[PDB]
Every structure is written in C-alpha cells, then in structure tokens.
Amino acid sequence: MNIFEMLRIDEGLRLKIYKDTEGYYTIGIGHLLTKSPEKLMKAFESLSLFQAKSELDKAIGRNTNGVITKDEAEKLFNQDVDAAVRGILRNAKLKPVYDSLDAVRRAALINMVFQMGETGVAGFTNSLRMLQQKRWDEAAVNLAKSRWYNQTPNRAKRVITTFRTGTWDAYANL
C-alpha cells in the first residue's frame, strides 16, 4: 500500500480520456485536462478536446491519442502529488500540520486536498490543530462531525481511520 493505491481506491483511475457531465476532460486518478463548452461553439468543442490531448501528451512524453498505461497514470499522479505538496508547503494553515505528521497521515491530508482543495482542507481549523497536536481520537471525532463525512462517508471513514491509526488498515482490507 502507498498513496497511489490509496487515491486509486478512493477516486479510481481512467486509462482513457473521459468527459464528465460538467464538460471536464479527465484521465488517470482524477487528473483534469481542459473544460469543454453554434458551429463556432462545436469548433471550440473540438478545440477543447485537442487541447486536452495536447496537455496529456505533453505530461506523459508521447502521443497517447487519449489512451495511457497504468504506469503512465502513476507518473501523472506523482506529478499531481508533487504539485499538491508544493501548494501545502506554501499554505500557512496547512504547512505546520503537514510537517508535523508522519508519512501515512501526510497521505491522508493529501487525499483530503485532492478531494476538496487546499481551501476546503484549510477550513477544518480545529481538526487540523488537533492533528498537529497528535490528538488522533479527538481529531477523528471532530472530522466525523463534518459535511465532508456526510457526503462521502466511506472515503471519509477511510481517511479518518488513517489519521486515527497512522496505518494503511482502512485500505489494505480490499
């Protein structure tokens, strides 16, 4: 178990470019490419797809034509992790807790940042303070008292267990 398998379990991974109902092109582990939007408008749809393919090819290092391997998805995900960590290390509300944590709990925090964004995670003021002070049980409870837990309770339960235990137990089960 590693952070790649963790985010795969929580978000899945696509080997083919997919356009969601909100017009976003996506591939890999939640990696967003471009946003798609009357003949000019359809021409901009073809443009948006081509821009997405161009971003993907540039990120992978070959002409993928929309299909990538699992290892390429992992490389993309590692790039996204590096970007997210750089964001965290620029964030006055997230850097101290992130630095105080161990690797597994750091993976849990990154998981939250991938799901809700830096601002969303930074909103959890009390829970983050409890994490920095290593009060695992209380941070788990107060995290369970959140809208995030009510919307995605299975992922939130796995992340919360990871924070509480500092182990991969909630993901190694399956």
């Binding site: 003949k39 000019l40 359809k42 021409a43 443009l47 393919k53 161009s54």
Partner: protein, 109 residues
C-alpha cells in the same frame, strides 16, 4: 490520427503556403473542417472553422477550403509568427466523434 496531412514544409517569409488534409466520406466528406494552430511552446488555439471562416482574433492572411474528402488551409504572405504545427479537425459520423490529423509543421526561414 484518422486524417492524414503532409508532414513538414519550410518556406521563406511572405511566400504562400498550402497545407492539405485527406479524409473519407464518414468525416470530411460530409462534415465541415476546423483548423487548429499551435505555436512552439504554446497551447493549441482555433485558427479556422466551418471550412473557411476565421476564428475570432485570427489574421486575415489565412483561408480555408473543402471539397470531396479533402480540405486545405492556405497562408498568404508567410510571417515569422506563423511557424507552427497545424492540425485539421472534423466530425466523423461513423466513429461518431471528433477526428484529427497528425499535424503539419511550417518552419519560417
């Protein structure tokens, strides 16, 4: 790429250049063509649409045409800023989706 273009062409400035693309009846034969430009190190942008219409903000020096299962993009008076990769795009009714060309590089010498 289901659409095929010519690979590469190098030209002097102020010369006319014509890129072409060949398709089939399922795509170019019955659907209009768009042209996409990508300068070195930049994101692709829309150059032309509806076979022969200029995309917003695109120079007067570009023109387009379509006939049969082929299409073309002509640059009159080549400028240094036109050095780029040019891609054809169209809708394929058989595949039922966007198909593109492999691109043509124009290098201004």
């Amino acid at each position: 790429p289901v659409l095929t273009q010519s690979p590469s062409v190098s030209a002097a400035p102020r010369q006319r250049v014509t890129i072409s693309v060949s398709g089939s009846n399922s795509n170019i034969g019955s659907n209009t063509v768009n042209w996409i430009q990508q300068l070195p190190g930049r994101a692709p942008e829309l150059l032309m649409y509806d076979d022969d219409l200029l995309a917003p903000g695109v120079s007067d020096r570009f023109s387009g045409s379509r006939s049969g299962t082929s299409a073309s993009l002509t640059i009159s008076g080549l400028q240094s800023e036109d050095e780029a990769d040019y891609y054809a795009a169209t809708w394929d009714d058989s595949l039922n989706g966007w198909v593109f060309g492999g691109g043509t590089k124009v290098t201004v010498l």
